[PDB]
Enzyme design. Structure first.
Site, PDB file in Angstrom:
ATOM      1  N   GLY A  28     -67.818  44.445 -50.730  1.00  0.00           N
ATOM      2  CA  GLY A  28     -67.888  44.055 -48.704  1.00  0.00           C
ATOM      3  C   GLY A  28     -69.892  43.787 -48.810  1.00  0.00           C
ATOM      4  CG  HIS A  57     -65.540  34.106 -49.075  1.00  0.00           C
ATOM      5  ND1 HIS A  57     -65.377  35.062 -49.576  1.00  0.00           N
ATOM      6  CD2 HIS A  57     -67.320  34.076 -49.841  1.00  0.00           C
ATOM      7  CE1 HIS A  57     -66.043  36.191 -49.555  1.00  0.00           C
ATOM      8  NE2 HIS A  57     -67.418  35.210 -50.250  1.00  0.00           N
ATOM      9  CB  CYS A 105     -69.807  38.434 -49.149  1.00  0.00           C
ATOM     10  SG  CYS A 105     -68.995  38.758 -50.899  1.00  0.00           S
TER      11      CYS A 105
HETATM   12  C1  LIG Z   1     -68.654  40.021 -50.367  1.00  0.00           C
HETATM   13  N1  LIG Z   1     -67.948  40.147 -49.230  1.00  0.00           N
HETATM   14  C2  LIG Z   1     -66.602  40.134 -51.491  1.00  0.00           C
HETATM   15  N2  LIG Z   1     -66.867  38.635 -51.592  1.00  0.00           N
HETATM   16  N3  LIG Z   1     -65.400  38.364 -52.911  1.00  0.00           N
HETATM   17  C3  LIG Z   1     -65.326  37.320 -52.868  1.00  0.00           C
HETATM   18  C4  LIG Z   1     -64.350  36.550 -52.584  1.00  0.00           C
HETATM   19  C5  LIG Z   1     -63.900  34.801 -53.321  1.00  0.00           C
HETATM   20  C6  LIG Z   1     -64.428  34.134 -53.351  1.00  0.00           C
HETATM   21  C7  LIG Z   1     -63.935  32.890 -53.779  1.00  0.00           C
HETATM   22  F1  LIG Z   1     -62.867  32.400 -52.857  1.00  0.00           F
HETATM   23  F2  LIG Z   1     -64.278  32.566 -55.049  1.00  0.00           F
HETATM   24  F3  LIG Z   1     -64.613  32.009 -52.725  1.00  0.00           F
HETATM   25  C8  LIG Z   1     -65.800  34.744 -53.231  1.00  0.00           C
HETATM   26  F4  LIG Z   1     -66.738  34.041 -53.887  1.00  0.00           F
HETATM   27  C9  LIG Z   1     -65.640  36.235 -53.568  1.00  0.00           C
HETATM   28  C10 LIG Z   1     -64.633  39.741 -53.238  1.00  0.00           C
HETATM   29  O1  LIG Z   1     -64.081  39.342 -53.894  1.00  0.00           O
HETATM   30  N4  LIG Z   1     -65.331  40.826 -52.901  1.00  0.00           N
HETATM   31  C11 LIG Z   1     -65.107  41.266 -53.959  1.00  0.00           C
HETATM   32  C12 LIG Z   1     -65.021  42.125 -55.337  1.00  0.00           C
HETATM   33  O2  LIG Z   1     -66.702  41.594 -55.464  1.00  0.00           O
HETATM   34  C13 LIG Z   1     -64.207  42.497 -56.566  1.00  0.00           C
HETATM   35  C14 LIG Z   1     -65.057  42.385 -57.645  1.00  0.00           C
HETATM   36  C15 LIG Z   1     -64.317  42.330 -58.496  1.00  0.00           C
HETATM   37  C16 LIG Z   1     -63.240  43.642 -58.507  1.00  0.00           C
HETATM   38  C17 LIG Z   1     -62.824  44.231 -56.587  1.00  0.00           C
HETATM   39  N5  LIG Z   1     -63.875  42.990 -56.115  1.00  0.00           N
HETATM   40  C18 LIG Z   1     -66.947  40.871 -52.428  1.00  0.00           C
HETATM   41  O3  LIG Z   1     -66.999  41.856 -51.876  1.00  0.00           O
END
Ligand SMILES: *C(=N)c1nn(-c2ccc(C(F)(F)F)c(F)c2)c(=O)n(CC(=O)c2ccccn2)c1=O
Ligand SMILES: *C(=N)c1nn(-c2ccc(C(F)(F)F)c(F)c2)c(=O)n(CC(=O)c2ccccn2)c1=O
EC number: 3.4.19.12
Lengths: 301, 301
Positions: free
Chosen positions: A143, A41, A145
């Site tokens: 970040g 992703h 992930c």
């Molecule tokens: C880790 N690096 C990370 N991953 N995501 C993220 C984005 C998209 C998917 C999908 F498409 F569903 F597979 C994911 F599974 C995971 C992410 O959004 N963030 C940022 C985050 O956790 C967040 C949550 C709330 C508000 C702002 N940001 C990641 O760090």
């Protein structure tokens, strides 16, 4: 003496953590030999996240979009590939710091160490357990992930987990290093149900044994019980049923404490039924289900 | 999301841990440049342990009695020296793996990571806190002496602790890397009193803040209180008194939660007075005093 949640030493894994960026998306990867592994992703974008077509998104992708950095060095992506939910970015340079490793898919109830990373830089290490709902309660900020979970069995690093996502529930889901999620989960920004989380009965009993070895011996009843009878008390309290394979794993701890497994299960029952009445065990007022019998032996001997 | 007890990555310290043997006595040492550091009770023997004369025992000693081993390599002791309760075994080879380091004596209430070692081989890493009685509750089996505690501040390893002994009480005592014990303790096999352990009030409040950032917001009262009034409730429950320096350190966490320090101290009071009534905070049914405000920011941001 002493019993604390303990992670494996992380040095062999630190050397493997790189940065991966794509568009406005930076996350961690794992570099072993000439392949970097990371969650796929990373090729998504905002409007893609609801139901991305990863095949199509990956076709539009050019190595140039894959910014792989280890330390201040920037690595050279010489191709891409999709194995399930994991992206394999092959590279020219092989990691000099690559340890003996293997990929293992772990079972619900097993523990692992997590090296939490941001921007390819290790931030801290802690212990987790794969719950029966195939979640892990973790500590993953934004970040995070691409952080991995691992055991050190001999000199061999056994990678079992790569973090992908936090579920709207506040718990975490991820894959093995071949890219298959633990659990029913998909890498889509949709509401997804984790199941009921049952307490890992064999882990709780291993802990009570650790308690006896570290002095805490008040919970001991001098009663007794049988498998069938205890298991009835287990479904009442959403505890995983006990098997003779479980009794068999607890045997070494039985021989060291002089306490028989069924006598301990009888102690457990009364804590489930009556409670702790404000007393404590190994510092906690709650029953702890994230030490395996193997963890307890590793420390308590 | 998530908040777990998290240790610093341990790789930079693993490369420094050697084995040290003397007679029938094997323990760990720390190798930085051409000096190995280890507890001086490695030169003792059984009948010495009640009141050893370390000066006399050290004079009788020959480098040959100092078996220093890193991995399967055996190092070359080119002299000895006693700095307080620490022995400095100078060697020909300097450690290629020596990180930027410094020696720091930490204050009661500060946290550090422990790399638990046996025979010079790292076994696991966990977080500790220096309590006000200058003990640490740890996980130290036999042979664990010479294990070190450290923080990673920038790229610099700040060694603060070397384990020496377990007190007949079941808690652990040790020194800084210049060999001065934390606390009133001496390296003699005699009964020694640790003081009263007061709960680290500023750490408990940092945790409640971590709770609010991770969702748990039931403890919040909507009441208020004053320093003097809360501190009266603190001596009642053996909590360390709060100062304006404490309030000042909690300020950044105040600005992020929109919760004022005094409003939080008022929430704390009611948990001390009424209790948790079976509820929980960040997974625990007990109040946790081993996260500093700095630890909480490190994770929660
Ligand atoms: C880790 N690096 C990370 N991953 N995501 C993220 C984005 C998209 C998917 C999908 F498409 F569903 F597979 C994911 F599974 C995971 C992410 O959004 N963030 C940022 C985050 O956790 C967040 C949550 C709330 C508000 C702002 N940001 C990641 O760090
Ligand atoms: C750690 N390597 C270690 N240290 N001691 C030990 C021995 C002597 C002193 C002295 F002289 F008081 F300074 C110490 F402070 C510490 C030790 O005894 N053990 C073994 C141990 O903990 C034990 C306890 C009960 C029964 C058997 N063994 C150490 O591992």
């Amino acid at each position: 003496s002493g019993f604390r949640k303990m992670a494996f030493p992380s040095g062999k894994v630190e050397g493997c953590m790189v940065q991966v960026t794509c568009g406005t998306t930076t996350l961690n990867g794992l570099w072993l030999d000439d392949v970097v592994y990371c969650p796929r992703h990373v090729i998504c974008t905002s409007e893609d996240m609801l139901n991305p077509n990863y095949e199509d998104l990956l076709i539009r992708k050019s190595n140039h979009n894959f910014l792989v950095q280890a330390g201040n060095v920037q690595l050279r992506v010489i191709g891409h590939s999709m194995q399930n939910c994991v992206l394999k970015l092959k590279v020219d340079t092989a990691n000099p710091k690559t340890p003996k490793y293997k990929f293992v898919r772990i079972q619900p109830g097993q523990t692992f160490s997590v090296l939490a990373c941001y921007n390819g830089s290790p931030s801290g290490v802690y212990q987790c357990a794969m719950r029966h709902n195939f979640t892990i309660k973790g500590s993953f900020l934004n970040g995070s992930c691409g952080s991995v979970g691992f055991n050190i069995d001999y000199d061999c690093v056994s990678f079992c987990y790569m973090h992908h996502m936090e579920l709207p529930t506040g718990v975490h889901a991820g894959t093995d290093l071949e890219g298959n999620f633990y659990g029913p989960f998909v890498d889509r920004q949709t509401a997804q149900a984790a199941g009921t989380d049952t307490t890992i009965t064999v882990n709780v009993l291993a802990w009570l044994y650790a308690a006896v070895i570290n002095g805490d011996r008040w919970f001991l009843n001098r009663f007794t019980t049988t498998l069938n009878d205890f298991n009835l008390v287990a479904m009442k309290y959403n505890y995983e049923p006990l098997t003779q394979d479980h009794v068999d794993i607890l045997g070494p701890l039985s021989a060291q404490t002089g306490i028989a497994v069924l006598d301990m299960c009888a102690s457990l029952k009364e804590l489930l039924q009556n409670g702790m009445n404000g007393r404590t065990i190994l510092g906690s007022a709650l029953l702890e289900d994230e030490f395996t019998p193997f963890d307890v032996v590793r420390q308590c001997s």
